[PDB]
């Protein structure tokens, strides 16, 4: 069985975290964003996975080569000259998707997180004998999204109603697909948006056919703190023994086995500390995320912020209000940040008392 | 009746017209100018070369100099727009300064920029203005 | 004869231009900033040049290797673990500065520009027989700088009353007999080392040129004026002239200019550029490979490498563009400090940092 993942570009809207590592290489809850659905593809026994990137993979070959042996999965890249809409990158990778058995392959987007029930979807495919499968999640705001008008009896879609002024539905696409090899021929050589041109072509043929979990489109660095809540919440349901606990722990916290915490601290709720970190004593972490190798000194109070790789927060420093730090950022002691988006390799010796972009 | 509207769409001594343009026959034009959408030019006006006109209306006896740019503006009577000068605005029909308005016989000098402001009649501008009301 | 150049770090205060290329590799008036004083060291016949950097030289080895043969000069790097004040990096490079002949070497700062009369300074050294030499320039604000009260005697920083107006210019001339007076601890040459020789009365020049401390990207347009002004005096045939040229303009032989343009004053267009028709350049500097489309109006701005200014786009008021920045047509920018690899399709009507 095969699979394909749509990445896109480098993650321009995720800077300064994507100034060095690309979008799928950003550590989300300890693990890079790409590992959240590759291991899920191992739950359904997918051997080979292709990436529909647009940039040069020369910067990430060392990372993808170390995951092929640890996870026992074949990982190959596909680079397109131009972004070919939404379904174009699939036309180029059709050669790496056809194994001969004519089995349906998965198509995933890097900008979405969920619980990924891929196992019980094949049974939903091998039951009625459909040709194409998509996943759908309910949203409170159907006007800001593209509404899918299906019947509530079998699961067949009919039309695409984007920005409905009146109520025609509330169910939208979730960015995860399940396509038979019999669809890779309906595409043209021209960049086609799968949401605007390809999907309506199969809906009118009535040859196609709900997500019981969380949905989040991560397209901005501030979505990492709100998207991590939905992730840790699902972890409290799936496996509650994977989240650390203790007298100094409040809420849902995902700590790494490598990370070390000092005494007299208070962490939570919704905090994720990467590996190789060094947390000193007297700190107060809340609604934040810590990436690899960064050491937080004593008596620091961090709330709802994002810490890059190999940074250093000085003693008694206060960080709050969606403060974004790049890689290797050294915050002096007693420094206050109120929403400072700092570039990597920067020493902060002044307070960022108001939202401001520092270079 | 679109033939009353200028539809050049080329360069046969006719400038590059980009739809929804009314050009008076008494105007003077240069084929290197791009007259964009939603522009209404009046009589006895001298249009310079390589100038860009979108979302604006120009009154009579206006002088447009070398490489001028006019966005979301209303140029008054007998006004003079200097060379490499720019007169733009946001286009917000709800904001007061969303459409920059120039008075009668206002002379915007060369390279002078006017962004979303209101200039009165018989006024000379040697310096660039922004988000103000010039008397 | 030897020489040493104090670079420092990567140029954190010069971003986004130093986000990719380090501080000394930024093209200033067509040429990289490092070549402005390397060729001046060849005017006095200096064979080897060492760089007292703080970052890893692995990113500029290809650049420093291409200048060793073109200029016939030995270029080697020195990397310190920590910044050791101002005189520390010289304590590490003492092994590469002593050739045995015991001749004085030069110490230059990468953040300073001048006319560099290095030739007539050796004669100013081989006349009275001094031990150490520095260069001094007059400034209108002596309180904001460190005043040298001159032979020099004392250091008066931030003088509330007037004790002088002459400050250091960042260019030195030191005998080999000075490399021993330093300690292993980080010592600042301006606060500790210079007073040690001043009290010894074993030191002793006025700079007859321009001085500019480039520590921010906006100083490139005003510092280019002082450079092009001095060029009108030294060699006036090095500045292009013509009916579309006004003031002092430095164009590259590789750069091509369209018709119906107006360039000046104080504009420097790098090599490999292609300027289209109807443009109006003034007080700006253009780097390599960037294409500016037709009918664009750019004033007092900085254009990065291999960028693109759309047609009818207006750029003014110290707008800073990174490498490979694509400005759409009819776009206005009023002081937008933009990051590299960014497509600008909206107006930056007010000063704003775009990523």
mmCIF file with all atom_site columns, N, CA and C in Angstrom, chain A residues 14 57 83 102 114 166 174 192 219 276 285 289 322 333 339 352:
data_model
loop_
_atom_site.group_PDB
_atom_site.id
_atom_site.type_symbol
_atom_site.label_atom_id
_atom_site.label_alt_id
_atom_site.label_comp_id
_atom_site.label_asym_id
_atom_site.label_entity_id
_atom_site.label_seq_id
_atom_site.pdbx_PDB_ins_code
_atom_site.Cartn_x
_atom_site.Cartn_y
_atom_site.Cartn_z
_atom_site.occupancy
_atom_site.B_iso_or_equiv
_atom_site.pdbx_formal_charge
_atom_site.auth_seq_id
_atom_site.auth_comp_id
_atom_site.auth_asym_id
_atom_site.auth_atom_id
_atom_site.pdbx_PDB_model_num
ATOM 1  N N  . UNK A 1 14  ? 4.889   30.614 8.784   1.00 0.00 ? 14  UNK A N  1
ATOM 2  C CA . UNK A 1 14  ? 5.265   30.050 10.074  1.00 0.00 ? 14  UNK A CA 1
ATOM 3  C C  . UNK A 1 14  ? 6.603   30.582 10.571  1.00 0.00 ? 14  UNK A C  1
ATOM 4  N N  . UNK A 1 57  ? 14.589  19.371 -1.565  1.00 0.00 ? 57  UNK A N  1
ATOM 5  C CA . UNK A 1 57  ? 14.724  18.531 -0.369  1.00 0.00 ? 57  UNK A CA 1
ATOM 6  C C  . UNK A 1 57  ? 16.154  18.354 0.120   1.00 0.00 ? 57  UNK A C  1
ATOM 7  N N  . UNK A 1 83  ? 3.859   25.145 -7.814  1.00 0.00 ? 83  UNK A N  1
ATOM 8  C CA . UNK A 1 83  ? 2.654   24.601 -7.178  1.00 0.00 ? 83  UNK A CA 1
ATOM 9  C C  . UNK A 1 83  ? 1.557   24.478 -8.222  1.00 0.00 ? 83  UNK A C  1
ATOM 10 N N  . UNK A 1 102 ? -3.540  -2.014 -7.477  1.00 0.00 ? 102 UNK A N  1
ATOM 11 C CA . UNK A 1 102 ? -4.720  -1.184 -7.600  1.00 0.00 ? 102 UNK A CA 1
ATOM 12 C C  . UNK A 1 102 ? -5.387  -0.970 -6.260  1.00 0.00 ? 102 UNK A C  1
ATOM 13 N N  . UNK A 1 114 ? -5.158  15.746 13.588  1.00 0.00 ? 114 UNK A N  1
ATOM 14 C CA . UNK A 1 114 ? -6.378  15.022 13.939  1.00 0.00 ? 114 UNK A CA 1
ATOM 15 C C  . UNK A 1 114 ? -5.982  13.761 14.701  1.00 0.00 ? 114 UNK A C  1
ATOM 16 N N  . UNK A 1 166 ? -26.990 31.803 3.200   1.00 0.00 ? 166 UNK A N  1
ATOM 17 C CA . UNK A 1 166 ? -27.991 31.041 3.926   1.00 0.00 ? 166 UNK A CA 1
ATOM 18 C C  . UNK A 1 166 ? -27.425 29.674 4.292   1.00 0.00 ? 166 UNK A C  1
ATOM 19 N N  . UNK A 1 174 ? -11.694 18.002 5.596   1.00 0.00 ? 174 UNK A N  1
ATOM 20 C CA . UNK A 1 174 ? -10.674 17.948 6.637   1.00 0.00 ? 174 UNK A CA 1
ATOM 21 C C  . UNK A 1 174 ? -9.258  17.778 6.098   1.00 0.00 ? 174 UNK A C  1
ATOM 22 N N  . UNK A 1 192 ? -4.730  22.112 -11.189 1.00 0.00 ? 192 UNK A N  1
ATOM 23 C CA . UNK A 1 192 ? -6.134  22.066 -10.816 1.00 0.00 ? 192 UNK A CA 1
ATOM 24 C C  . UNK A 1 192 ? -6.256  22.038 -9.302  1.00 0.00 ? 192 UNK A C  1
ATOM 25 N N  . UNK A 1 219 ? -1.734  27.442 10.355  1.00 0.00 ? 219 UNK A N  1
ATOM 26 C CA . UNK A 1 219 ? -1.182  28.286 9.316   1.00 0.00 ? 219 UNK A CA 1
ATOM 27 C C  . UNK A 1 219 ? -0.498  29.518 9.868   1.00 0.00 ? 219 UNK A C  1
ATOM 28 N N  . UNK A 1 276 ? 16.325  16.963 25.563  1.00 0.00 ? 276 UNK A N  1
ATOM 29 C CA . UNK A 1 276 ? 17.560  17.688 25.784  1.00 0.00 ? 276 UNK A CA 1
ATOM 30 C C  . UNK A 1 276 ? 17.415  19.023 26.476  1.00 0.00 ? 276 UNK A C  1
ATOM 31 N N  . UNK A 1 285 ? 5.493   27.437 34.054  1.00 0.00 ? 285 UNK A N  1
ATOM 32 C CA . UNK A 1 285 ? 5.151   27.265 32.652  1.00 0.00 ? 285 UNK A CA 1
ATOM 33 C C  . UNK A 1 285 ? 3.655   27.014 32.513  1.00 0.00 ? 285 UNK A C  1
ATOM 34 N N  . UNK A 1 289 ? 4.986   26.020 24.876  1.00 0.00 ? 289 UNK A N  1
ATOM 35 C CA . UNK A 1 289 ? 5.658   24.859 24.301  1.00 0.00 ? 289 UNK A CA 1
ATOM 36 C C  . UNK A 1 289 ? 7.158   25.111 24.256  1.00 0.00 ? 289 UNK A C  1
ATOM 37 N N  . UNK A 1 322 ? 1.889   35.370 23.692  1.00 0.00 ? 322 UNK A N  1
ATOM 38 C CA . UNK A 1 322 ? 2.258   34.844 22.376  1.00 0.00 ? 322 UNK A CA 1
ATOM 39 C C  . UNK A 1 322 ? 3.618   35.369 21.914  1.00 0.00 ? 322 UNK A C  1
ATOM 40 N N  . UNK A 1 333 ? 18.532  38.116 32.053  1.00 0.00 ? 333 UNK A N  1
ATOM 41 C CA . UNK A 1 333 ? 17.744  37.995 33.267  1.00 0.00 ? 333 UNK A CA 1
ATOM 42 C C  . UNK A 1 333 ? 16.797  39.181 33.405  1.00 0.00 ? 333 UNK A C  1
ATOM 43 N N  . UNK A 1 339 ? 4.722   39.787 23.762  1.00 0.00 ? 339 UNK A N  1
ATOM 44 C CA . UNK A 1 339 ? 4.427   39.521 22.369  1.00 0.00 ? 339 UNK A CA 1
ATOM 45 C C  . UNK A 1 339 ? 5.550   39.886 21.420  1.00 0.00 ? 339 UNK A C  1
ATOM 46 N N  . UNK A 1 352 ? 10.595  43.660 25.999  1.00 0.00 ? 352 UNK A N  1
ATOM 47 C CA . UNK A 1 352 ? 9.633   43.794 24.913  1.00 0.00 ? 352 UNK A CA 1
ATOM 48 C C  . UNK A 1 352 ? 8.262   44.010 25.537  1.00 0.00 ? 352 UNK A C  1
#
